[PDB]
Write an enzyme that holds these catalytic residues in place. Structure first.
Site, PDB file in Angstrom:
ATOM      1  N   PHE B 315       0.863  -1.211   0.000  1.00 39.52           N
ATOM      2  CA  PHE B 315       0.000   0.000   0.000  1.00 39.52           C
ATOM      3  C   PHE B 315       0.891   1.251   0.000  1.00 39.52           C
ATOM      4  O   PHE B 315       0.556   2.251  -0.659  1.00 39.52           O
ATOM      5  CB  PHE B 315      -0.929   0.008   1.215  1.00 39.52           C
ATOM      6  CG  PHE B 315      -2.078  -0.969   1.178  1.00 39.52           C
ATOM      7  CD1 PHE B 315      -2.171  -1.951   0.199  1.00 39.52           C
ATOM      8  CD2 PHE B 315      -3.063  -0.920   2.154  1.00 39.52           C
ATOM      9  CE1 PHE B 315      -3.232  -2.844   0.191  1.00 39.52           C
ATOM     10  CE2 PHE B 315      -4.121  -1.815   2.143  1.00 39.52           C
ATOM     11  CZ  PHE B 315      -4.203  -2.775   1.163  1.00 39.52           C
ATOM     12  N   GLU B 423      -8.449   6.486   3.236  1.00 40.20           N
ATOM     13  CA  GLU B 423      -7.738   5.629   2.242  1.00 40.20           C
ATOM     14  C   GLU B 423      -8.478   4.279   2.151  1.00 40.20           C
ATOM     15  O   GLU B 423      -7.862   3.286   1.721  1.00 40.20           O
ATOM     16  CB  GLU B 423      -6.290   5.513   2.737  1.00 40.20           C
ATOM     17  CG  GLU B 423      -5.306   4.814   1.818  1.00 40.20           C
ATOM     18  CD  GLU B 423      -3.855   4.789   2.305  1.00 40.20           C
ATOM     19  OE1 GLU B 423      -2.949   4.637   1.461  1.00 40.20           O
ATOM     20  OE2 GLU B 423      -3.614   4.902   3.531  1.00 40.20           O
ATOM     21  N   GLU B 432     -14.875  -1.787   0.509  1.00 42.86           N
ATOM     22  CA  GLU B 432     -14.214  -1.957   1.830  1.00 42.86           C
ATOM     23  C   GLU B 432     -14.990  -1.185   2.889  1.00 42.86           C
ATOM     24  O   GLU B 432     -14.598  -1.266   4.047  1.00 42.86           O
ATOM     25  CB  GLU B 432     -12.751  -1.549   1.753  1.00 42.86           C
ATOM     26  CG  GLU B 432     -11.952  -2.561   0.969  1.00 42.86           C
ATOM     27  CD  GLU B 432     -10.491  -2.220   0.783  1.00 42.86           C
ATOM     28  OE1 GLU B 432     -10.043  -1.219   1.388  1.00 42.86           O
ATOM     29  OE2 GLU B 432      -9.814  -2.950   0.032  1.00 42.86           O
TER      30      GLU B 432
HETATM   31  C1  LIG Z   1      -2.053  -4.664  -5.823  1.00 43.97           C
HETATM   32  C2  LIG Z   1      -2.404  -6.086  -5.384  1.00 43.97           C
HETATM   33  C3  LIG Z   1      -1.821  -6.433  -4.010  1.00 43.97           C
HETATM   34  C4  LIG Z   1      -2.514  -5.645  -2.901  1.00 43.97           C
HETATM   35  C5  LIG Z   1      -4.028  -5.889  -2.896  1.00 43.97           C
HETATM   36  C6  LIG Z   1      -4.467  -7.302  -2.542  1.00 43.97           C
HETATM   37  C7  LIG Z   1      -3.630  -8.235  -1.940  1.00 43.97           C
HETATM   38  C8  LIG Z   1      -4.102  -9.503  -1.644  1.00 43.97           C
HETATM   39  C9  LIG Z   1      -5.411  -9.858  -1.927  1.00 43.97           C
HETATM   40  C10 LIG Z   1      -6.260  -8.941  -2.512  1.00 43.97           C
HETATM   41  C11 LIG Z   1      -5.789  -7.672  -2.815  1.00 43.97           C
HETATM   42  N1  LIG Z   1      -4.527  -5.555  -4.245  1.00 43.97           N
HETATM   43  C12 LIG Z   1      -5.542  -4.667  -4.426  1.00 43.97           C
HETATM   44  O1  LIG Z   1      -5.979  -4.381  -5.525  1.00 43.97           O
HETATM   45  C13 LIG Z   1      -6.165  -4.004  -3.255  1.00 43.97           C
HETATM   46  O2  LIG Z   1      -7.045  -4.599  -2.656  1.00 43.97           O
HETATM   47  N2  LIG Z   1      -5.695  -2.778  -2.936  1.00 43.97           N
HETATM   48  C14 LIG Z   1      -6.123  -1.946  -1.876  1.00 43.97           C
HETATM   49  C15 LIG Z   1      -7.238  -2.139  -1.057  1.00 43.97           C
HETATM   50  N3  LIG Z   1      -7.546  -1.278  -0.104  1.00 43.97           N
HETATM   51  C16 LIG Z   1      -6.840  -0.201   0.135  1.00 43.97           C
HETATM   52  C17 LIG Z   1      -5.712   0.055  -0.644  1.00 43.97           C
HETATM   53  C18 LIG Z   1      -4.851   1.229  -0.475  1.00 43.97           C
HETATM   54  N4  LIG Z   1      -5.361   2.388  -0.030  1.00 43.97           N
HETATM   55  O3  LIG Z   1      -3.674   1.131  -0.775  1.00 43.97           O
HETATM   56  C19 LIG Z   1      -5.354  -0.821  -1.656  1.00 43.97           C
HETATM   57  C20 LIG Z   1      -3.919  -6.249  -5.387  1.00 43.97           C
HETATM   58  C1  LIG Z   2      -4.689   1.528   4.635  1.00 42.56           C
HETATM   59  S1  LIG Z   2      -5.987   0.391   4.212  1.00 42.56           S
HETATM   60  C2  LIG Z   2      -7.329   0.752   5.323  1.00 42.56           C
HETATM   61  C3  LIG Z   2      -6.937   0.987   6.794  1.00 42.56           C
HETATM   62  O1  LIG Z   2      -8.029   1.586   7.516  1.00 42.56           O
HETATM   63  C4  LIG Z   2      -8.215   0.946   8.766  1.00 42.56           C
HETATM   64  N1  LIG Z   2      -9.651   0.959   9.122  1.00 42.56           N
HETATM   65  C5  LIG Z   2     -10.675   0.367   8.482  1.00 42.56           C
HETATM   66  N2  LIG Z   2     -11.843   0.583   9.126  1.00 42.56           N
HETATM   67  C6  LIG Z   2     -11.565   1.317  10.188  1.00 42.56           C
HETATM   68  C7  LIG Z   2     -12.321   1.894  11.293  1.00 42.56           C
HETATM   69  N3  LIG Z   2     -13.644   1.717  11.369  1.00 42.56           N
HETATM   70  N4  LIG Z   2     -11.665   2.619  12.220  1.00 42.56           N
HETATM   71  C8  LIG Z   2     -10.329   2.813  12.170  1.00 42.56           C
HETATM   72  N5  LIG Z   2      -9.567   2.298  11.183  1.00 42.56           N
HETATM   73  C9  LIG Z   2     -10.128   1.569  10.185  1.00 42.56           C
HETATM   74  C10 LIG Z   2      -7.685  -0.467   8.571  1.00 42.56           C
HETATM   75  O2  LIG Z   2      -7.217  -1.074   9.774  1.00 42.56           O
HETATM   76  C11 LIG Z   2      -6.567  -0.279   7.566  1.00 42.56           C
HETATM   77  O3  LIG Z   2      -5.323  -0.070   8.228  1.00 42.56           O
END
Ligand SMILES: C[C@H]1CC[C@H](c2ccccc2)N(C(=O)C(=O)Nc2cncc(C(N)=O)c2)C1
Ligand SMILES: CSC[C@H]1O[C@@H](n2cnc3c(N)ncnc32)[C@H](O)[C@@H]1O
Ligand SMILES: [Cl-]
Ligand SMILES: [Cl-]
Lengths: 302, 625
Positions: B315, B423, B432
Site C-alpha cells: 500500500f 484511504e 471496503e
Molecule cells: C495490488 C495487489 C496487491 C494488494 C491488494 C491485494 C492483496 C491480496 C489480496 C487482494 C488484494 N490488491 C488490491 O488491488 C487491493 O485490494 N488494494 C487496496 C485495497 N484497499 C486499500 C488500498 C490502499 N489504499 O492502498 C489498496 C492487489
Molecule cells: C490503509 S488500508 C485501510 C486501513 O483503515 C483501517 N480501518 C478500516 N476501518 C476502520 C475503522 N472503522 N476505524 C479505524 N480504522 C479503520 C484499517 O485497519 C486499515 O489499516
C-alpha cells in the site's frame, strides 16, 4: 527392402518399378527398386537396381523410360534418373515446395510437365526440364487425395480432395478449375482413372467402396456399382483394345470390371491393403498388384 | 525471448530430426507418434490382424525428452465425424490408440485439428479419454484464423468466392472452437493452437479470440514476405498480431518447409526473436504486475480483518498515490487558512485508517509545503499497525501526532476536525465500506469540514474471457454451495479478456454526506451497447475518487492515474456464460445491500437474456461491518 509396398508400375518394355515406405519401426524412410525379372519381386537379391530415399513415398510414376517422379512425405517432389546401364538410380532433383506430405503425382501427356497434389491442399504444375514450379493452385479446402493428368492433353487433368470436390482442370482458362460430379454431395472421392479411348469420360472411386463412371461433356453420373466394402485407393484401366477396370481397396481385395462395372475377377491373395496395380504390356491378361503385406502377386485375368 | 517449437509431418529418424531442430534453435518438436499415412484397421479381417510393431519404440528417447520436447499430433487420416459408419468406428478406436500412446509417453501436449463445423464425435472421444483417470497431458485444438474454404484461390469458374460482407460467416472458425470447447464442458486441458494464414481477416474476427485459452500460435513459412537481403519477415499487420500474442505469452510453432532456401531455419525463428526484443519495454504498472496476470485473489477486508505487515508495505510502495494525497491536503490548507492567519490558525487534521502512517507523513509534508500549522491525529483500529505508529510517534513525530487506537465509528474525539483524510477505498470504491466508516466518523467533523476524499464512484464494464470464467469455475470448494465461487467478486489483474462496452458509473458516495436520510444501499441499472459477437463471462469493476477539487485517483483504464499500482480491477463473474450478438444490449443490474452486521452486492443480467440473481441475501459473499 521396407515392409509397406506403395507403388507398382510396368515400363513400355516389361520391367517392374517398385516404390515402398517404412510406415512403422525406427526409420520411417522409403526406396525405389527396378525388377527386369517381374516374377523375382519382391526379393532384393534378384533386383536389377534399387535406392534409399531420405523419406517415404506416397505416390510414384514413370517419366518416360529412365525417369521416376516421387511424392515424398518430406513435402519434396523427387525426380530420379536411371543409370546409362540401368544398374543405379540417381537423384536428378529434390525440390521442397509443398508444406506437407506430397500424397499424389501424375505426368502430363507431353512428359516435360507434371502435377503434384499435397496434404497442404495446394496443387502445383512442374517443369521437369527446368526443375521449378510454373503454377501454384490452392483450389481445394482440404488435403488433396488424387491428381490424374489427361492421357492426351497437357493443359487438362482431374483432382479430388477430402473437401468432396472433383475438379476438372484446363490451364488455358483464366479460372482453370471446374467442379463436376454427381447431383448431391455423395461420399468423398479417393481415386481417379481417365478412360484410355474416350478422353471425354473418367471413373472415380469413393471412401465407401463405390466406383462411378462420369461423362465430363454430359456432367451426369451415368453408372456406379458397390464393388468394395471399404475405401477405393486406386483405379487402373487395362491396355486392352476394349479395356478392363482394376479397382484396389483397403478391404485387401482386387476386383476387375468390364465397361458397365460388373464384377469379372476378384482376388483376396493380399491379406493387407492393396496399394497399386499395373497391367503387363507383354501379356495383356497378366496384372501385377502390390500391398502392405509386402506381397507382389501376378494375376491371370479371363 | 520466445518459447518456440517446430511442426513436422515427416520424421525419418526421431534421434536425428530432434537433433536438427534443437540446433536450429527450437524449444520443442510437434511430430506424429504413428506414421501419418499408416492407416490401421480395427474391425474387418484381414488388415485387422496386421503384424506389429504399430510404431517406433518409446526407448528411442528419455522419459525426460518425451515429457519436455515432444508434442504429439493426431494422424490426419483419423476422422471420427466421417459420414461413413466404418470410418467413424475405425477412427474412434484409432483416436483412443493415438491419445493413449501420447499418455503412455507422458507428452506435455497433443495436437487435434478443428477444420470442419461438425466435430461432435471428435469431442465425445477426446472427452471420453480425458475422464479415464486425472493425467496432466494438455490438448491443443489446431484452429485456423480463416477456414481454408474461405481462403481458397478464386479459380473455380462455376463455384466462385462470394465478394459480399459475411460478418458472422467470417467468424465461423471461432464457432467451431466454441462448440467443441462447450461439448467438452470447458475442460482446462483443452486449449487453442491458433493457425494464422497468408491474408489476415477483419479485426472483429481476430478480436473473437480474446479471452480464449490460446497456448499456441502456428505460423506456416508461406505467410512470410521476403525483404531485400533475402531474410523472411512478416507484414506490418502480422507484426501487430505477433505483439498481441506475445503479451499472451503463447508458444509459437513454425509449420511447413523452408521457402527462403538461402537462409537456415534459425532465420524464421530469429525474426520472432527480433520482434519480441523490439517491443515497447514494460512500464511501471506492467513490470510490477507481471506475475499477477489473471490471478484471482479474494478482496481484502481491512475493516473485518487486520491487514498483515507486508500488505500495508505494498500500500505504502506507491509514490504517485501519496504525491496526490500530499497535494490534495496542500490545496485544502490554503483554501481554509488565509495567508495572514498562518501563525495564528493551526488546523485539526484526522487520518482515519492511518495503517503504518504514510498518510500521516503526507499530512506533515503537505503542511510545511503550504506553510500552515496542523495538529495530527492518527486513528487506526489495527493494533498490530498501531504498534508501528506509536514507535514512529515516539521516535520521530512527537506530540504533534496523537495516535488513537480505535474504530472511527466508536472514538469519542476531544475536538472536531477541519479535515478527515481516509484511504478506505477498494478496487470497487465502496467495497471496503469507506461509506459506513466515514459515516460513523462524521459527527466529529466541524460543520464546515472537508473529507479527503470527498467523492468516489464505482465503474462496471461487461467482459468476455472463457479463461477467467474457467479460473472461477475451478474455485469450487467442499463444504459450501457448488456454485458459490460465481456469486463473489475477485481482485484480479484482468488480462486475456475483452472489454465488450465502455465502463459506465455504478455507485457514487459523497463525504461529508449532510443528507438527513443517510442510506448507503443502492439499485443502479446499466445498459451496455455491444458492437461485436462475443460471450459474456462477468463484469470488470474499477473506481474513480476526488481527493480534493481537481486532484483525483482512477483505476478506470480510460482515466487511469499514471503509474499507480495500489489497486487491481475487481471481477463480478456470472454462473452461466451469455451469448451476445452484435448490436444487442447487455443490461446488468447491481444492488449494494446491508443489515446491522454485513454489506454485500447482489447482481443480475436482464438482457439480452436474464441471469439468476447472484449472491442473494449475501449467502455466498458478505463484507463485515
Ligand atoms: C495490488 C495487489 C496487491 C494488494 C491488494 C491485494 C492483496 C491480496 C489480496 C487482494 C488484494 N490488491 C488490491 O488491488 C487491493 O485490494 N488494494 C487496496 C485495497 N484497499 C486499500 C488500498 C490502499 N489504499 O492502498 C489498496 C492487489
Ligand atoms: C490503509 S488500508 C485501510 C486501513 O483503515 C483501517 N480501518 C478500516 N476501518 C476502520 C475503522 N472503522 N476505524 C479505524 N480504522 C479503520 C484499517 O485497519 C486499515 O489499516
Ligand atoms: Cl496426452
Ligand atoms: Cl470474444
Amino acid at each position: 527392402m521396407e515392409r509397406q509396398l506403395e507403388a507398382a508400375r510396368y515400363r513400355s518394355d516389361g520391367a517392374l518399378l517398385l516404390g515402398a515406405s517404412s510406415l512403422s519401426g525406427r526409420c520411417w524412410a522409403g526406396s525405389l527398386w527396378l525388377f527386369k525379372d517381374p516374377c523375382a519381386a519382391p526379393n532384393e537379391g534378384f533386383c536389377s537396381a534399387g535406392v534409399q530415399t531420405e523419406a517415404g513415398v506416397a505416390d510414384l510414376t514413370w517419366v518416360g523410360e529412365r525417369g521416376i517422379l516421387v511424392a515424398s512425405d518430406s513435402g519434396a517432389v523427387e525426380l530420379w534418373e536411371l543409370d546409362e546401364n540401368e544398374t543405379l538410380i540417381v537423384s536428378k532433383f529434390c525440390k521442397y515446395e509443398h508444406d506437407d506430405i506430397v500424397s499424389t503425382v501424375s505426368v502430363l501427356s507431353s512428359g516435360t510437365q507434371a502435377v503434384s497434389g499435397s496434404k497442404d491442399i495446394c496443387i502445383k504444375v512442374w517443369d521437369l526440364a527446368q526443375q521449378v514450379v510454373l503454377s501454384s493452385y490452392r483450389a481445394h479446402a482440404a488435403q488433396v487425395t488424387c491428381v490424374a493428368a489427361s492421357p492426351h492433353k497437357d493443359s487438362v487433368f482431374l483432382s479430388c480432395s477430402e473437401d468432396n470436390r472433383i475438379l476438372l482442370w484446363d490451364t488455358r482458362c483464366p479460372k482453370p478449375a471446374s467442379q463436376i460430379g454427381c447431383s448431391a454431395p455423395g461420399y468423398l472421392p479417393t481415386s481417379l482413372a481417365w478412360h484410355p479411348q474416350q478422353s471425354e469420360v473418367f471413373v472415380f472411386g469413393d471412401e465407401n467402396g463405390t466406383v462411378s463412371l462420369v461423362d465430363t461433356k454430359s456432367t451426369s453420373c451415368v453408372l456406379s456399382s458397390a464393388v468394395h466394402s471399404q475405401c477405393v485407393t486406386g483405379l487402373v484401366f487395362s491396355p486392352h483394345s476394349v479395356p478392363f477396370l482394376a479397382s484396389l481397396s483397403e478391404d485387401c481385395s482386387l476386383a476387375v470390371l468390364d465397361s458397365s462395372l460388373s464384377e469379372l475377377f476378384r482376388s483376396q491373395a493380399h491379406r493387407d491393403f492393396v496399394r497399386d496395380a499395373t497391367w503387363s504390356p507383354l501379356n495383356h491378361s497378366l496384372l501385377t498388384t502390390v500391398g502392405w503385406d509386402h506381397q507382389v502377386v501376378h494375376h491371370v485375368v479371363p | 525471448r520466445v518459447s518456440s517449437g517446430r511442426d513436422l509431418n515427416c520424421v525419418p529418424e526421431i534421434a536425428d530430426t530432434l537433433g536438427a531442430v534443437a540446433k536450429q534453435g527450437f524449444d520443442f518438436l510437434c511430430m506424429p507418434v504413428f506414421h501419418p499415412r499408416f492407416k490401421r484397421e480395427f474391425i474387418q479381417e484381414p488388415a485387422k490382424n496386421r503384424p506389429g510393431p504399430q510404431t517406433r519404440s518409446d526407448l528411442l528417447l528419455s522419459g525426460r525428452d518425451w515429457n519436455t520436447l515432444i508434442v504429439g499430433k493426431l494422424s490426419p487420416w483419423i476422422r471420427p465425424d466421417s459420414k461413413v459408419e466404418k470410418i467413424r468406428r475405425n477412427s474412434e478406436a484409432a483416436m483412443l490408440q493415438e491419445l493413449n500412446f501420447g499418455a503412455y509417453l507422458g507428452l506435455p501436449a497433443f495436437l487435434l485439428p478443428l477444420n470442419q463445423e461438425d466435430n461432435t464425435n471428435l469431442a465425445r472421444v477426446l472427452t471420453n479419454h480425458i475422464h479415464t483417470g486425472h493425467h496432466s497431458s494438455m490438448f491443443w485444438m489446431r484452429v485456423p484464423l480463416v477456414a481454408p474454404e474461405d481462403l481458397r484461390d478464386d479459380i473455380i469458374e462455376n463455384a466462385p468466392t462470394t465478394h459480399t460482407e459475411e460478418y458472422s460467416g467470417e467468424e465461423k472458425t471461432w464457432m467451431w472452437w466454441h462448440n467443441f470447447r462447450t461439448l467438452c464442458d470447458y475442460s482446462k486441458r483443452i486449449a487453442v493452437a491458433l493457425e494464422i494464414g497468408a491474408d489476415l481477416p477483419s479485426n472483429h474476427v481476430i478480436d473473437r479470440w480474446l479471452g480464449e485459452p490460446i497456448k499456441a500460435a502456428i505460423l506456416p513459412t508461406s505467410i512470410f514476405l521476403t525483404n531485400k537481403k533475402g531474410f523472411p519477415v512478416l507484414s506490418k499487420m502480422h507484426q501487430r498480431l505477433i505483439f498481441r500474442l506475445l503479451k499472451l505469452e503463447v508458444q509459437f510453432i513454425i509449420t511447413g518447409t523452408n521457402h527462403h532456401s538461402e537462409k537456415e531455419f534459425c532465420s524464421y525463428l530469429q525474426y520472432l526473436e527480433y520482434l519480441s526484443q523490439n517491443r515497447p519495454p514494460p512500464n511501471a504498472y506492467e513490470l510490477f504486475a507481471k506475475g499477477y496476470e489473471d490471478y484471482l485473489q479474494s478482496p481484502l477486508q481491512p475493516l473485518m480483518d487486520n491487514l498483515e505487515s507486508q500488505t500495508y508495505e505494498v500500500f505504502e510502495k506507491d509514490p504517485i498515490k501519496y504525491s496526490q494525497y500530499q497535494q490534495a491536503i496542500y490545496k485544502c490548507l490554503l483554501d481554509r487558512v488565509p495567508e495572514e492567519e498562518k501563525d495564528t490558525n493551526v488546523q485539526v487534521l484526522m487520518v482515519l485508517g492511518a495503517g503504518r502512517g504514510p498518510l500521516v507523513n503526507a499530512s506533515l509534508r503537505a503542511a510545511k509545503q503550504a506553510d500552515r500549522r496542523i495538529k495530527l491525529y492518527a486513528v487506526e483500529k489495527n493494533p498490530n499497525a498501531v504498534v508501528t505508529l506509536e514507535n514512529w510517534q515516539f521516535e520521530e513525530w512527537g506530540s504533534q501526532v496523537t495516535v488513537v487506537s480505535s474504530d472511527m465509528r466508536e472514538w469519542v474525539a476531544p475536538e472536531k476536525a477541519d479535515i478527515i483524510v481516509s484511504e478506505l477505498l477498494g478496487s470497487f470504491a465502496d467495497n471496503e465500506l469507506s461509506p459506513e466508516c466515514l459515516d460513523g466518523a462524521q459527527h466529529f467533523l466541524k460543520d464546515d469540514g472537508v473529507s479527503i476524499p470527498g467523492e468516489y464512484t464505482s465503474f462496471l464494464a461487461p467482459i468476455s474471457s472463457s479463461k477467467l470464467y474457467n479460473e472461477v469455475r475451478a474455485c469450487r470448494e467442499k463444504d459450501r454451495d457448488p456454485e458459490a465461487q460465481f456469486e463473489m467478486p475477485y481482485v484480479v489483474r484482468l488480462h486475456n479478456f475483452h472489454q465488450l462496452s465502455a465502463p459506465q458509473p455504478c455507485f457514487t458516495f459523497s463525504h461529508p454526506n449532510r443528507d438527513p436520510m443517510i442510506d448507503n444501499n443502492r439499485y443502479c441499472t446499466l445498459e451496455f451497447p455491444v458492437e461485436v459477437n462475443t460471450v459474456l463471462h462477468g463484469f470488470a469493476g474499477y473506481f474513480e475518487t476526488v481527493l480534493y477539487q481537481d486532484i483525483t485517483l482512477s483505476i478506470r483504464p480510460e482515466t487511469h492515474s499514471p503509474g499507480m499500482f495500489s489497486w487491481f480491477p475487481i471481477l463480478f463473474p456470472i454462473k452461466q456464460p451469455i451469448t451476445v450478438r452484435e448490436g444487442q444490449t447487455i443490461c446488468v443490474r447491481f444492488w449494494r445491500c446491508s443489515n446491522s452486521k454485513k454489506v454485500w452486492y447482489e447482481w443480475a443480467v436482464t438482457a439480452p437474456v436474464c441471469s439468476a440473481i447472484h449472491n442473494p441475501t449475501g449467502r455466498s459473499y458478505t463484507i463485515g461491518l
